[PDB]
Amino acid sequence: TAAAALDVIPNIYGLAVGGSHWGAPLNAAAEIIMIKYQADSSKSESLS
Amino acid sequence: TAAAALDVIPNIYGLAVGGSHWGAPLNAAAEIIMIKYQADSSKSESLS
Amino acid sequence: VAQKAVLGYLNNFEEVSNLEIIAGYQDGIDIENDKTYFVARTRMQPYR
Amino acid sequence: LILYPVIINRDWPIELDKTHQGDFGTVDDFTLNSNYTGDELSLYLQSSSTYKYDFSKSKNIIYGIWKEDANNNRCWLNYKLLTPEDYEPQINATLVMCDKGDVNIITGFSLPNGGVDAGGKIKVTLRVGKKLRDKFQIKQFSQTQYLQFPEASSADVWYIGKQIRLNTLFAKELIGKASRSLDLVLSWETQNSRL
Amino acid sequence: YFWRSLDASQRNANSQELYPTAWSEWKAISVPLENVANGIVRPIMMDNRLYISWFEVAEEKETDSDGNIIVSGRYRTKIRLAHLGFDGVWSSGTTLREEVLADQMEEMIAVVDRMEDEPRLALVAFKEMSESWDVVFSYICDSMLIESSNLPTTTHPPKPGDGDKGLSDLDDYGANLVWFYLHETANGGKAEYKQ
Amino acid sequence: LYISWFEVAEEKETDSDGNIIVSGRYRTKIRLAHLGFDGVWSSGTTLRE
């Protein structure tokens, strides 16, 4: 989360401006969900 | 770790400057954690 | 191991004790009986 | 400030302002009652100041309440045909007017011509009562967030004037003790700390 | 990066020496520190909590209203801090106040716990070697990670004559502190600072 | 339940004459989300820009 949050800020200066990867936070969130699933699934094994 | 550390440096020169992917180190760290988990989990199998 | 676990819980509880309110909205005109809702965020980054 | 829904008051409109018009007079020249009626406005224009516009000379004077707008739709709402020898006549009209704009009305004396006449009038602006708003307040004192109720003139709902804590600095103790051990945290002293 | 500690207790009562136990193990640090500004860091341990602090900076190519580049160059910079959890793991770390300084203040950091008062406040400062009028940037925090409130008023108020900027109380204080270390140096000349 | 906020960023617009419009301008947009009956947050959405 923090990584994408940081990457929200613009990248470019001078005679041009280039912003940031707008979708990065949402992409991260999706992956976060996946990571949650990953942990959960792994836990089940130990119990079994 | 070293990859992101290297990518900290700026990319762009001339009439403009464009820095670097600010979040890259933190993203790498997260993935590093995941990689640790990956190894650990794999080890358990061999023992079993 | 239990100690580790509880220390983790305590750690999160720190952030709970550090939660800062931001805003609130009343369910209706009768403050003296209508419920109300509130939103708050972490002092520690990343902001949650 | 604490937020809350916008809701129509559904009572007398909020009167905005008044002006006077015609060949004479002042804004003080008529007293207007304007209570709401359920879906409709209702008006009760008690004239004064006939003696400051037209009296005992012009006759069959239209003493009227009539509409106004960006077009001066001076359409008659209610009027009495009289000689303003009666210095303080009264006329009234319920006005459905469910369009929730700012209602403009002319109220006063006119000749049968209904304009450019010695009869004079005042003009009034009315608005739907948006305000059902009431105070409630987030507060800050020292480091802690807190709440307090209004000192309302309302009935003695115990809520009035009360104040409530919102936050705690307990964290400091956790830092100081858990760092070492949970036992220090669990100590009776900790549970009985004057935090 | 790694940290470790050493006790000054654990001597034998007879010995001009300390038990081997006095040396701690070397321990890894998990923070993604490679963004560090200048290969510089300071640890602080207080109230049994360990903290790590540093700063980072990058230049930004700002431009004039006239569209042209402001060729003087300016430096986005920010103060960074992390701490260890009771569970024995490093915080993700965080940023305090930011700045975009008109110059590359970069000559390292000063950090200490303060007891000029009971709160045991946390403070961090940074510097640039104007051998006189040394330039300082700093921040101060309540242990609950709240920017500290009270301070003595500026020794150099804004507009002390044509030095219209003066200083902010915060940095005025921090400057005094670092001066109390790199000019007040009977404890050791400022050349010794690096060690 | 709903949650609402906004976001904005500056864009370096330029004149017909090619030069930069030095006044500066700000792309901005209104954002809203809501909770589902199933007890999970909407992905959120944007209104007028």
Highlighted features:
part of a larger assembly; 60% helix; 48 residues; mainly alpha; 6 chains
Describe this entry's structure for a reader:
This is part of a larger assembly, with 6 copies of chain A. With 48 residues, chain A is mainly α. Chain A contains 2 helices and 1 strand. Chains in contact: A-B, A-C, A-E, A-F, B-E, C-D, C-E, D-E, E-F. At the C-D interface, helix 1 and strand 1 of C face helix 1 of D. Strand 1 (13-14) of chain A pairs antiparallel with strand 1 of chain B, so a sheet runs across the interface. Chain E: This is Toxin subunit YenA2. Chain E: Part of an orally active toxin complex (TC) with strong insecticidal effects on larvae of the Coleoptera Costelytra zealandica, Acrossidius tasmania and Adoryphorus couloni and some Lepidoptera larvae. The TC has an endochitinase activity. Chain E: It comes from Yersinia entomophaga.
Task: Please write out the topology.
The structure is cut from a larger assembly and holds 6 copies of chain A.
Chain A: H1 2-6, E1 13-14, H2 24-47
Function (chain D): Part of an orally active toxin complex (TC) with strong insecticidal effects on larvae of the Coleoptera Costelytra zealandica, Acrossidius tasmania and Adoryphorus couloni and some Lepidoptera larvae. The TC has an endochitinase activity.
Protein name (chain D): Toxin subunit YenA2
Subcellular location (chain D): Secreted
